[PDB]
Design a protein around this ligand. Structure first.
Ligand SMILES: [Mg+2]
Ligand SMILES: [Mg+2]
Ligand SMILES: [Mg+2]
Ligand SMILES: [Mg+2]
Ligand SMILES: [Mg+2]
Ligand SMILES: [Mg+2]
Ligand SMILES: [Mg+2]
Ligand SMILES: [Mg+2]
Ligand SMILES: [Mg+2]
Ligand SMILES: [Mg+2]
Ligand SMILES: [Mg+2]
Ligand SMILES: [Mg+2]
Ligand SMILES: [Mg+2]
Ligand SMILES: [Mg+2]
Ligand SMILES: [Mg+2]
Ligand SMILES: [Mg+2]
Ligand SMILES: [Mg+2]
Ligand SMILES: [Mg+2]
Ligand SMILES: [Mg+2]
Ligand SMILES: [Mg+2]
Ligand SMILES: [Mg+2]
Ligand SMILES: [Mg+2]
Ligand SMILES: [Mg+2]
Ligand SMILES: [Mg+2]
Ligand SMILES: [Mg+2]
Lengths: 77, 46, 242, 72, 227, 122
RNA sequence: AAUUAUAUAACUUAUCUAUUAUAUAGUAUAAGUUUGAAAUUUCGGUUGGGGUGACC
RNA sequence: UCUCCAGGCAUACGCGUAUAACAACUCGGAUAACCAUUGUUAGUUAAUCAGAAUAGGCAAUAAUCACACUAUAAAUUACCUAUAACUUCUCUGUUAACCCAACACCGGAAUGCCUAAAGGAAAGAUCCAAAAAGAUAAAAGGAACUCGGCAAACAAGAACC
RNA sequence: GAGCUACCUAAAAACAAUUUUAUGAAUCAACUCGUCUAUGUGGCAAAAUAGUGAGAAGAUUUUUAGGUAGAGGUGAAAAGCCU
């Protein structure tokens, strides 16, 4: 069951979330207001970003299954 | 052999070894700049 | 030349000028005060006097705490005041032998602990001392609330205190929802620690975190001077009409 | 905005126009607006260096007025 | 700055370009001496899990066709391209494998012994005691790790209950479950041990830097006047 | 022996090193290295008609100069906004909500020329 | 050579878990023992000069 | 115009105005002429030379005139499936006798083309002493020299530890 | 501090003519090296010059960028090399 791809070359897992987030009812203090990273404040969580319009140079396609021409039956080309 | 010509100039090598971006990469290099700023050097880095 | 103030007073003068001055008075008191943590790695002298055996006379005794190194990994767990003792030893326990570097390390375990006020179970790095303190305090929630910052010695622990204090202060109905009776019992059990809402918010904040909080609170975009002059003109016109 | 650089000084930072928000730019996040503690000694050395210059500057003006008063 | 070249996640039969180490590790320091230079090479992704059913197919014995038996720069043995269904995968070739041969890959654990034909992959339980085997896996599903060199064949000494004993080429006896899959036959290039390097330059073609030129029982007290 | 004091420019270094002299970009580089100039990105010089213009580069030495009174927000507000509000207040047709009537803009978004952040050059 | 040596390696007793009928397992640590990668320090005196001896 | 010598022209890397004209004649060239020096003014022009959209699927078959021919050290974005956009020329490198060796250093310095059509000057004037360095010739002899055939030779062959 | 040097990684280059063969083969350029003698000895040169020599399709040579750092690195061991 040898698996290709040595672990060192894989993208690293996201850093563990700050423990202040675990505590319920507590509003973390993060560096969002400063608009830059600092090591001694908590890391913000941002919602997904939407440009509000389509920029042709940075178009990103939908996944395979969401394509209009997706068909479950396979076609051999 | 004749010595004295150990310097083979190369701008790519120079800016990579002693440049601004290189000095800021590690905290010890940042302190190299801090010393030179305190001394008053006109050239902080290559 | 000379500085006007001794260097040890510089931190106090910094807290007393600028945005630091505008920070809450109660919060500054926690910053200002320094209290020795309860002894952990040394035996304190029971008395203030002892009888010297060699000369048989009474001489004063004082407690000098050992220097203990607290790795940053400790701030993400609940060590009960324990830390690393970085010191030296004498080989063979004779001072005429070589002096050797020695480090004494705490025995760390991973344990899962339940907080009633938060109604959540946390997995924490802990020492056997920390478990004993909780037992002596008759509850995990009692341990965090009773223990002071200096004894607690953990940023994770201090954040737990703020959440618990904030939970009690607001009587948040988010605890065990649909069970007011069960909730009521929990809040009643810990009623001794209830404090005003404003104070509880600033509990356990570091100086940098406190400063960012204060900056956010007073952050405000400028008022278009069109409105400001309009207010002045209306007031003058209204006053003249009076 | 007013920001502190990696050398421990307070400098006004002029903003730039970008098409993406700051938390998504990777060229912006390499820039550091904080100083690590190893800068603290250098912060004090600047204050003491500046204090020496100003003290010398005051002393000289006092000496110069003595020359004026003796001359006039 | 050392980034390992072994960064390809997906299996392919296309040869993959290798970056050489030089005996140095990610730190940049020599960890093994005597490795350096040599000929440039390409890595052909071998597949040592013989019974890998094709995607979206049932788990039962299948057959594959041998396209070509080829020289491999990266190992002592030789490799065989094998095709079955819609899949091509490199595999290690046995002593007698030729192009156009057919080789079975069986999951069924024969209650009785199954006649052994070289090149077919069978669980150790199926094979009879004494059969020469190669490409043995320690645990079911792991993949072959032992007896993978040229002309190296181990024997299956014994089978009792759910486990069997394997005599590795070093004569070291190992024990594995009878469910483990072992290929039959020798591993090919049996004469690899007969090869002669001849000239010092040939080892410098295989990436073998020269050896360096640098040229314990404490007596007990009662036996120190006799040392 | 390299010169540490002179400015780093594109004339120095190997061919691969290139950098600009401060000229603003006017286009985009697509893949396969095609430059696409954008018409809107190229500045347009708005020049007025100077026919019948009475003002020339220099002024009479006989012309009296004026006392400097740099413009202030109060002076601008009094000259422009005070006359309307004062008259309207007497008429009683005044409220805080309708400050736009006198020229106030609650937000700069949507305007071609925004006063902050400035989005137009001199 | 003298003094050390949580370099690696091993065991032993605790500590902490699992289990089990007391018991065999493991182990973010402490205390021992064994091994010794290393570290620190030194090179008494008198004897045409060098072996050994000797002598103080 | 004559006499004679025989690595030159490009690019890369590097250097950073040493480029060219004029005017100067202090400093710099190890001296003069003249300028490589000082001051002033100029210069290197490029859509071809040179530099700087997204997501999936998949690869057995070297090179060497690549045919034959064997071989061993086993060896270089494409093509498809969908999505998106639906007429564009700005920016920068461009000079020289040049760089690394404290110097206008008998040294070091990658590649392509070519070998004199390109590029150059060994002698400031005079004098022909010793000693010193180099080249050429040698009556008769031919290692007698010398630690040793070192160096040289109209020699450069043969053998043995 | 590895622009010298030691070793390495990646991407690139160069090898005419002649004879053997099918090559760490031969003669001999370019190129790499530095055997012996003389000159030089503050020299043209902090290791050169002039001759004479060794290799010259390979464990060859060269170019560019990267790596390993002093309790260390590198070493076909000379305690060599690391401006
Ligand atoms: Mg030098
Ligand atoms: Mg070089
Ligand atoms: Mg040996
Ligand atoms: Mg000129
Ligand atoms: Mg002139
Ligand atoms: Mg000039
Ligand atoms: Mg081009
Ligand atoms: Mg030119
Ligand atoms: Mg000279
Ligand atoms: Mg000519
Ligand atoms: Mg001449
Ligand atoms: Mg003459
Ligand atoms: Mg002669
Ligand atoms: Mg003669
Ligand atoms: Mg004689
Ligand atoms: Mg003789
Ligand atoms: Mg001779
Ligand atoms: Mg190098
Ligand atoms: Mg040839
Ligand atoms: Mg040869
Ligand atoms: Mg030869
Ligand atoms: Mg030869
Ligand atoms: Mg070597
Ligand atoms: Mg030796
Ligand atoms: Mg040196």
């Amino acid at each position: 069951a040898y698996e290709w791809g040595v672990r060192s070359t894989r993208k690293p897992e996201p850093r563990p979330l700050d423990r202040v987030y675990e505590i319920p009812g507590l509003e973390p203090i993060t560096y969002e207001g400063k608009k830059h990273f600092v090591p001694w404040l908590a890391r913000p969580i941002f919602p997904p970003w939407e440009r509000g319009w389509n920029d042709p140079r940075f178009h990103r396609a939908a996944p395979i299954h969401e394509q209009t021409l997706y068909k479950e039956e396979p076609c051999y080309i | 052999r004749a010595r004295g010509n150990e310097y083979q100039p190369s701008n790519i090598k120079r800016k990579h070894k002693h440049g601004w971006v290189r000095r800021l990469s590690t905290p010890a290099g940042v302190q190299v700049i801090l010393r030179r700023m305190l001394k008053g050097r006109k050239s902080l880095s290559h | 030349p000379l500085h006007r103030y001794p260097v040890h007073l510089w931190q106090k003068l910094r807290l007393r000028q600028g945005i630091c001055a505008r920070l809450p008075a109660h919060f500054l008191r926690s910053l200002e005060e320094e209290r020795t943590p309860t002894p952990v790695h040394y035996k304190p002298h029971g008395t203030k006097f002892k009888i010297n055996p060699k000369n048989g006379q009474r001489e004063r005794v004082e407690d000098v705490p050992i220097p203990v190194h607290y790795p940053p990994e400790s701030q993400q767990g609940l060590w009960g005041g324990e830390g690393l003792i970085l010191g030296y030893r004498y080989a063979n326990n004779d001072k005429l032998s070589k002096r050797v570097k020695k480090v004494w390390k705490p025995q760390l375990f991973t344990r899962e602990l339940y907080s009633e006020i938060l109604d959540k179970k946390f997995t924490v790095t802990v020492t056997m001392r920390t478990l004993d303190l909780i037992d002596e305090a008759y509850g995990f929630d009692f341990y965090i609330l009773k223990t002071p910052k200096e004894d607690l010695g953990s940023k994770f622990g201090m954040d737990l205190k703020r959440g618990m204090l904030l939970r009690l202060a607001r009587q948040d109905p988010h605890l065990h929802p649909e069970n007011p009776e069960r909730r009521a019992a929990i809040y009643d059990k810990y009623r001794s620690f209830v404090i005003p809402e404003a104070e509880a918010e600033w509990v356990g904040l570091t100086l940098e975190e406190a400063l960012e909080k204060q900056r956010l609170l007073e952050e405000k975009d400028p008022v278009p001077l069109f409105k400001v002059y309009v207010e002045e003109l209306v007031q003058r016109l209204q006053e003249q009409v009076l | 905005a007013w920001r502190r650089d990696i050398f421990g000084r307070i400098v006004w930072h002029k903003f730039k126009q970008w098409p993406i928000p700051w938390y998504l730019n990777k060229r912006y996040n390499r820039r550091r607006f904080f100083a690590m503690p190893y800068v603290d000694r250098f912060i004090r050395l600047r204050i003491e260096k500046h204090a020496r210059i100003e003290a010398r500057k005051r002393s000289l003006q006092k000496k110069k007025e003595k020359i004026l008063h003796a001359k006039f | 700055k050392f980034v390992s070249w072994k960064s390809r996640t997906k299996y392919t039969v296309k040869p993959v370009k290798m970056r050489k180490s030089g005996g140095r590790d990610h730190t940049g320091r020599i960890r093994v001496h005597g490795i350096g230079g040599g000929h440039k090479q390409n890595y052909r992704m071998i597949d040592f899990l013989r019974f890998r059913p094709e995607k979206e197919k049932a788990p039962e014995p299948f057959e594959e066709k041998v396209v070509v038996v080829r020289y491999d720069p990266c190992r002592s043995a030789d490799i065989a391209l094998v095709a079955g269904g819609s899949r091509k995968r490199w595999i290690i070739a046995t002593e007698n494998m030729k192009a156009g041969d057919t080789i079975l890959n069986s999951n069924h654990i024969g209650r009785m012994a199954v006649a052994a034909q070289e090149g077919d992959a069978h669980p150790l339980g199926a094979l009879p005691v004494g059969t020469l085997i190669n490409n043995v896996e320690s645990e079911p599903g792991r993949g072959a790790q032992y007896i993978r060199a040229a002309g190296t064949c181990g024997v299956l000494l014994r089978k009792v209950n759910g486990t069997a004993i394997i005599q590795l080429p070093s004569k070291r006896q190992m024990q594995v479950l009878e469910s483990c899959t072992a290929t039959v036959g020798r591993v090919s290039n049996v004469n690899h041990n007969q090869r002669v390097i001849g000239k010092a330059g040939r080892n410098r073609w295989l990436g073998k830097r020269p050896n360096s030129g640098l040229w314990k029982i404490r007596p007990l007290p009662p036996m120190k006047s006799y040392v | 022996g390299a010169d540490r004091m002179s400015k780093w420019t594109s004339k120095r270094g190997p061919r691969t090193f290139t950098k600009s002299r401060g000229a603003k970009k006017t286009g985009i580089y697509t893949s396969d290295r095609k430059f696409v100039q954008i018409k809107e990105m190229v500045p347009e010089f708005v020049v007025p008609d100077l026919t019948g213009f009475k003002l020339k580069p220099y002024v009479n030495y006989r012309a009296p100069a004026g006392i400097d009174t740099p413009l202030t927000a109060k002076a601008l507000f009094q000259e422009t906004v005070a006359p309307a509000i004062e008259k309207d207040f007497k008429e009683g047709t005044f409220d805080a909500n309708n400050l736009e009537k006198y020229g106030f803009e609650p937000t700069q978004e949507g305007k071609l020329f925004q006063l902050y952040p400035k989005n137009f050059p001199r």
